[PDB]
Amino acid sequence: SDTICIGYHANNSTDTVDTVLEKNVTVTHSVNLLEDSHNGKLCRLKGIAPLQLGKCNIAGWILGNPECESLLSKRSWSYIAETPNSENGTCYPGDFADYEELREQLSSVSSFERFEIFPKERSWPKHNITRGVTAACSHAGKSSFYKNLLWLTETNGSYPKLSKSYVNNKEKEVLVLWGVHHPSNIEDQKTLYRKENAYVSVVSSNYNRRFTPEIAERPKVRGQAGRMNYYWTLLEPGDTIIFEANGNLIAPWYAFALSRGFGSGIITSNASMDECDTKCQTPQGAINSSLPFQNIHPVTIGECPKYVKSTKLRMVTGLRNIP
Amino acid sequence: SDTICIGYHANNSTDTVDTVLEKNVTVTHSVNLLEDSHNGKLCRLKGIAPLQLGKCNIAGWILGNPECESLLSKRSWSYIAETPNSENGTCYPGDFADYEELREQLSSVSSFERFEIFPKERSWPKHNITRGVTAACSHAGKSSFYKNLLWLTETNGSYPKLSKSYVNNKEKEVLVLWGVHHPSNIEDQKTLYRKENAYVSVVSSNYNRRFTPEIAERPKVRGQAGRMNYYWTLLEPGDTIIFEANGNLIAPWYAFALSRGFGSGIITSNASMDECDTKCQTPQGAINSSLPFQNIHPVTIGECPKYVKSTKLRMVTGLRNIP
Amino acid sequence: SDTICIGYHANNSTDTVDTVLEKNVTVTHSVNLLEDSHNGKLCRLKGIAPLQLGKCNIAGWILGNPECESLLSKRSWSYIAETPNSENGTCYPGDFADYEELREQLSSVSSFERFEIFPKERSWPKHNITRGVTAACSHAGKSSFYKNLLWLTETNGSYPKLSKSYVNNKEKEVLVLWGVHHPSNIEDQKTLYRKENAYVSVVSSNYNRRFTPEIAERPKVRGQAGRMNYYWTLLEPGDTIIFEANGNLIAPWYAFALSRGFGSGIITSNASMDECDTKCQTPQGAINSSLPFQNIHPVTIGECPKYVKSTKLRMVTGLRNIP
Amino acid sequence: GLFGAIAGFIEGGWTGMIDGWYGYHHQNEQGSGYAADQKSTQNAINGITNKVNSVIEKMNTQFTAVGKEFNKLEKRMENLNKKVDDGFLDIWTYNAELLVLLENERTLDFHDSNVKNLYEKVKNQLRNNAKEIGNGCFEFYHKCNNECMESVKNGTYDYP
Amino acid sequence: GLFGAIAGFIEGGWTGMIDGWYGYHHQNEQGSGYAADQKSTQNAINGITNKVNSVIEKMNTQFTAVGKEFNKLEKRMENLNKKVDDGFLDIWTYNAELLVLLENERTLDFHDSNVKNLYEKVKNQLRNNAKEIGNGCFEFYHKCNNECMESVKNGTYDYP
Amino acid sequence: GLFGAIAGFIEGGWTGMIDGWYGYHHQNEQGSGYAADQKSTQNAINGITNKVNSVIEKMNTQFTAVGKEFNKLEKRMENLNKKVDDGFLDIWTYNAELLVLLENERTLDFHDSNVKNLYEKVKNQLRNNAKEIGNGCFEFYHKCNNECMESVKNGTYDYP
Ligand SMILES: *[C@@H]1O[C@H](CO)[C@@H](O[C@@H]2O[C@H](CO)[C@@H](O[C@@H]3O[C@H](CO)[C@@H](O)[C@H](O[C@H]4O[C@H](CO)[C@@H](O)[C@H](O)[C@@H]4O[C@H]4O[C@H](CO)[C@@H](O)[C@H](O)[C@@H]4O)[C@@H]3O)[C@H](O)[C@H]2NC(C)=O)[C@H](O)[C@H]1NC(C)=O
Ligand SMILES: *[C@@H]1O[C@H](CO)[C@@H](O[C@@H]2O[C@H](CO)[C@@H](O[C@@H]3O[C@H](CO)[C@@H](O)[C@H](O[C@H]4O[C@H](CO)[C@@H](O)[C@H](O)[C@@H]4O[C@H]4O[C@H](CO)[C@@H](O)[C@H](O)[C@@H]4O)[C@@H]3O)[C@H](O)[C@H]2NC(C)=O)[C@H](O)[C@H]1NC(C)=O
Ligand SMILES: *[C@@H]1O[C@H](CO)[C@@H](O[C@@H]2O[C@H](CO)[C@@H](O[C@@H]3O[C@H](CO)[C@@H](O)[C@H](O)[C@@H]3O)[C@H](O)[C@H]2NC(C)=O)[C@H](O)[C@H]1NC(C)=O
Ligand SMILES: *[C@@H]1O[C@H](CO)[C@@H](O[C@@H]2O[C@H](CO)[C@@H](O)[C@H](O)[C@H]2NC(C)=O)[C@H](O)[C@H]1NC(C)=O
Ligand SMILES: *[C@@H]1O[C@H](CO)[C@@H](O[C@@H]2O[C@H](CO)[C@@H](O)[C@H](O)[C@H]2NC(C)=O)[C@H](O)[C@H]1NC(C)=O
Ligand SMILES: *[C@@H]1O[C@H](CO)[C@@H](O[C@@H]2O[C@H](CO)[C@@H](O)[C@H](O)[C@H]2NC(C)=O)[C@H](O)[C@H]1NC(C)=O
Ligand SMILES: *[C@@H]1O[C@H](CO)[C@@H](O)[C@H](O)[C@H]1NC(C)=O
Ligand SMILES: *[C@@H]1O[C@H](CO)[C@@H](O)[C@H](O)[C@H]1NC(C)=O
Ligand SMILES: *[C@@H]1O[C@H](CO)[C@@H](O)[C@H](O)[C@H]1NC(C)=O
Ligand SMILES: *[C@@H]1O[C@H](CO)[C@@H](O)[C@H](O)[C@H]1NC(C)=O
């Protein structure tokens, strides 16, 4: 006798998915929705490589700490990656004004040129340009100082009032950094600046601040009982910045012509760089951005899938596997 | 032979909806869930019309920049709208303290009266009240100044210390604004205020700040190398505010008795104001708030449908259209 | 003839649930998803009792307002609870610097010891330590002052410059608070400190600030026309804080060695203390955190169910009740 | 589709039936016409309306001013605000799109179920006095006049 | 309702069946009584509890102090904070309300399905040894004693 | 399960059918083999792929740097930032898990329905020329050669 039967597919599959009524249901075909792994490497976003700081953090690198490598080309970066061993910042103790804000703004740049804004060899004819070194910023056993700043001091027994201006002839922003030095006692103030009451004045079209040195005995940091506070400003194209000072000015020596980009960020990662392109960067490494969810890290940079605390998220495509 | 059949509806409809299993499905009846259009007009929220500034931004309007229209009657508004062509603000260059915060707090007021807190003609008998004009704030080709401030200067070769007090006899907050003038050189400081070292002191029960003028040559903005910093405070009902000055005081002339409302915001719109009512305002125009979603703009004011990046969101109510 | 029928359960149940197609459907068995009630009591989170302030807010408690009860035993708390009747803060008028930030950081501590950082009787041998009382901070009808601060004044007709240092010999952070007094007139400034121009300097390894008194006639608050601004800093283990002063210094008398915990918060609550343990605290009382949603209050502390504006959320487990 | 009636054994729709969503088409010597079953179509009009109102009206929204202003030294606050706005945008966009996709599939299943149940209600009454053609029709073994027709739709079909 | 059994051809429930969710009511010369089908109801009791447990237990919540305090010159941060609280409130309220409505509809559809499958299981077993009464009952053409009755519930009904 | 075919009267799957998801197994005097019904499997392959792509492709995500940095006097802003991250983390985790839990049950229901409709398609064609054995099989009363077999699958089975 003849027969015909109706049936459905079965496979050798051992995939299991969860349903609302039953957990651990063996199915024939399934697709994963959860991005589960990274490549352990720092990759390029939008085709541009990140700025990798090693021994230095953003503070020490932008100031020119003697332990940081300087940028010698017209660079650009999609994000900033600093090492867990990036402990070289302000080798001379002091306060960095709006430091977190400067970091968020330097996180992504499309152009970045370092240039002599106030050349040491010709800008200060009536001040001493060589005494401004310190054991706090020592390099190779000798005393030094920041590579992008200049510590002006008295010469021939005087520190005359200075007025140095810079006009931004670049067609982009120019980040100008400087410092204000605060001695520990009135004797050290007289030795370096030959007056008890000095002042620093920095002005532009949108920036206007006067700095008065505060002299007081403080605890020693990096062997130094004095402090010098650090300040910066973004100078717009066509604008003028003017430094007017009686003393205690840590004058700018190099500045940075830059074009800031669509806000990125900073990851702290000991992972190494590879010649790869990614759309999503995790502190542990880059991840594929095709799936809608990832559980690698909540702090990501890029065009990223949403972070979930889940461990298993796959949708069944086939049937219940009943062999 | 007789028959009876079971069937379903079909019509000439061509509405299409998306399903999870099939796209572009022709259905008989459907309802839209996505708000898709605006009316291109600035409407009233909660029945109250917005404050639309024309040539001026919030800075210039509240200070009395000579190009801004003044409020004659006691007003009220649900939000503030400024034009992309609002380029008249602080015509004398300077820093506006906590400007974004003042904007957020003035965004919606339930009463707003402008009144002479310190009448120009009778409050300053021993200072000059007519010299305080400048080419930066010019109106109709002649030199002018803010309509709500007074630039006090010396008379008979002196600027004696002044102390004018105001008691808030109104039963609401009183927004008081004032300025401190910072000349470009010591000669202009001596000419205007007959002192090398002056001070401005503004105090209340919760506000306590002393201002020292910083004299320095700065780049020229609107032809002015000097600056004026602008300050404000909300004077609580019953409180007394005291101005004490040696010079450089840009004294208040008019103040504002106001009652702040449930926090609103500011939209920038070239769209025109109309006599319309809405429950949701978009910078491009008002939208209906009946549907749960809108795709016009993410920055809205009012009881608004949630903004989504979608282009089509309609739910099928009828059947598959099979004619 | 014999029969067998197929049917389903029905009971006396009156539970109703809402469905997408029909409202108010009577079902046989159902489960609640919405936590609807609290116990009206402040309980211990993470097994640790909160710090309950009574007459005082965090300002008055941490400074030692004469109306606050002290906890002379080493303590710890999981969160801070203050009453709606906590109106005792800074009884002498002034500004408390970064008060909200200090409140957020004292919200959770695992250890908290108050100790004599600068013993009143022997730290100031050439200053008067008994005159520093005021009618603004009166206790029991006699004038008093903060219990954790000391108002130094002149003695024998002089106020010599002081330099007092404290080294953090504790193995945790030490919260150090101090104040700067700004007299109402120059005559009282000479009376208390025997100088017109004085200065206060507080420094550590990471803190560097100079305070100069501003003398001006102000409105009387709590009967006082003068002001005292209050400042604080967290002194790291092993670090030194140095006070150097010419006058107007409200010197620290007691400080707090503490170890901050994983960030908690502050609730304002009319509810009372009970000997209970909870996983989620509401300003009205503790709630069960087993259900996924609660509608008691949106501002909670702990591992809490998500707050919803809903009034009924129940899932049907049984059938439609059709008797 | 899911219950096999609309895309299935009832191959197409009746443009001639304007009275409701589901109904009957009779053919006897007394006449012919389309008639909607107002009992079944009303329960679907009620159910769908309660579904549509649930998606729209359960959107409890308070007064809010989305826009925030920051200055040159507040870029972090600006990016945190952009994160808050963009986060809600992703959630609502994603949830709204899938909500329409999932519940539209269920609504179409709902009609399919209502059609098959209506067919099954008639089949249960006409037990074996008619041949089930397999296409949604019943060919009567006896003469069913209009009085008998109104009784099949009304639910009052006497069996003998 | 959706599968036509509960709101449909099996018009009502049995308060007499206290043993389980779905079952049988037999009547023979040996007696009559209610009996629950524990095989089918247990799979439903298991699935629904697994459904409810997934909704409650998948709520991963960390420690948080929701409230943040700001001063007179921090209103923007305060309103930005208000935006975050009101935003999460809108999302959870909308999703919570809709989830309970949608999944309650599915649970009742789920029960409807379990009853119809049980009915269809008996109909397929008795094939044509009994008349289908149309209300969930089967009138046997032969005498079915308790041994024959228990064999229908057990799933082992011999055809001859 | 929900439509009673897969977990129900068709007790198991066919490892012998590698051609598709649902199909037939015929046995006649001419021979025997498994054959997949490409009409049914393709609509499910189309629908399931459209469902899976909707979950993946509806994820509109912009460029974002999640991390934000704060200093010692910005603890409140730091805690507000964690609230935004953990709030999004709680929301996405909960919705993703339930979406997979709910929609996987529907996919299995979807297959069950396609299997049930295929059985129902054959039963309506083989109106009564074969006995339904109750396990998904039909025993022919007449000699059905391969042409008659292919005509059942093609949808064009002549009645006599
Ligand atoms: C770039 O980074 C590298 C790596 O971080 C830096 O190299 C480190 O430099 C520090 C110097 O600050 C060095 O640690 C010191 O070593 C000294 C020599 O033994 C110690 O004297 C010094 O002790 C001080 O700090 C201790 C910390 O608690 C105190 O307990 C101790 O008492 C000292 O404190 C002061 O006390 C008295 C006053 O009472 C004063 O006279 C003392 O001189 C002292 O100042 C530190 O332990 C690290 O070992 C170095 N690490 C490495 C790997 O080299 C490098 O300097 C950075 N360079 C730049 C340019 O930034
Ligand atoms: C701990 O907290 C408790 C309460 O929580 C404090 O007790 C309250 O303290 C207030 C303030 O002193 C006190 O109110 C005063 O009562 C006086 C009569 O007993 C009034 O004369 C006084 O009036 C002034 O304030 C009014 C505010 O509405 C003004 O309208 C009025 O004009 C007064 O202002 C004069 O004073 C100022 C100078 O202060 C001057 O510049 C003005 O021009 C004007 O001349 C107050 O209303 C309450 O009675 C107290 N209540 C209780 C229950 O004790 C307690 O002081 C706190 N303790 C500490 C140590 O902080
Ligand atoms: C209100 O806003 C308008 C628009 O900005 C102001 O007018 C503008 O004034 C500036 C100078 O203040 C003009 O720029 C200058 O132009 C002159 C020649 O015209 C040139 O010498 C300068 O180098 C500079 O380029 C600008 O053209 C002018 N624009 C318009 C449309 O008039 C006006 O001054 C503002 N008024 C107040 C009170 O703020
Ligand atoms: C700037 O000051 C430095 C002092 O540090 C001068 O260098 C010293 O010069 C004297 C004599 O000229 C020598 O005896 C020292 O040994 C030098 N010290 C160092 C560290 O080099 C320097 O000459 C001054 N330069 C100018 C232009 O005035
Ligand atoms: C206030 O300042 C104005 C402007 O400087 C003074 O007016 C000037 O007076 C001199 C003296 O006669 C005249 O030469 C100028 O022409 C006047 N200026 C203008 C614009 O008219 C005024 O005298 C000063 N004092 C008072 C009390 O107003
Ligand atoms: C510290 O200040 C107090 C208060 O000014 C001085 O005590 C006062 O002395 C006068 C006269 O001897 C008495 O009339 C007051 O009654 C005292 N007041 C109090 C509160 O005791 C005290 O002598 C000063 N001590 C030093 C060392 O300067
Ligand atoms: C799921 O079922 C398989 C069946 O073999 C079993 O091996 C596995 O351990 C189960 N997993 C869980 C989590 O129960
Ligand atoms: C330094 O000052 C003295 C003052 O007499 C002067 O003679 C000498 O020329 C000056 N040196 C330089 C290098 O200007
Ligand atoms: C949707 O389907 C119809 C079917 O006739 C087709 O004509 C139409 O082009 C499709 N939609 C679009 C946008 O092309
Ligand atoms: C729900 O129905 C019950 C009766 O079944 C009735 O007593 C009650 O008032 C109804 N509630 C609402 C909110 O409709």
From TrEMBL, chains D, E, F:
Disulfide bond annotation, renumbered to this chain: 144-148
Keywords: Clathrin- and caveolin-independent endocytosis of virus by host, Clathrin-mediated endocytosis of virus by host, Disulfide bond, Fusion of virus membrane with host endosomal membrane, Fusion of virus membrane with host membrane, Glycoprotein, Hemagglutinin, Host cell membrane, Host membrane, Host-virus interaction, Lipoprotein, Membrane, Palmitate, Signal, Transmembrane, Transmembrane helix, Viral attachment to host cell, Viral envelope protein, Viral penetration into host cytoplasm, Virion, Virus endocytosis by host, Virus entry into host cell
Signal peptide residue numbers: none
Alphabetical GO biological process terms: clathrin-dependent endocytosis of virus by host cell; fusion of virus membrane with host endosome membrane; fusion of virus membrane with host plasma membrane; viral budding from plasma membrane; virion attachment to host cell
Subcellular location: Host apical cell membrane; Virion membrane
GO cellular component, one term: virion membrane
Modification after translation (UniProt): Palmitoylated.
One example GO MF annotation: host cell surface receptor binding
Primary role: Binds to sialic acid-containing receptors on the cell surface, bringing about the attachment of the virus particle to the cell. This attachment induces virion internalization of about two third of the virus particles through clathrin-dependent endocytosis and about one third through a clathrin- and caveolin-independent pathway. Plays a major role in the determination of host range restriction and virulence. Class I viral fusion protein.
Subunit note: Homotrimer of disulfide-linked HA1-HA2. Interacts with human CACNA1C.
Family as reported in the entry's similarity comment: Belongs to the influenza viruses hemagglutinin family.
Protein name: Hemagglutinin
Natural source organism: Influenza A virus
Organism ancestry: Viruses, Riboviria, Orthornavirae, Negarnaviricota, Polyploviricotina
Span of the entire protein shown here: 345 to 504 of 566
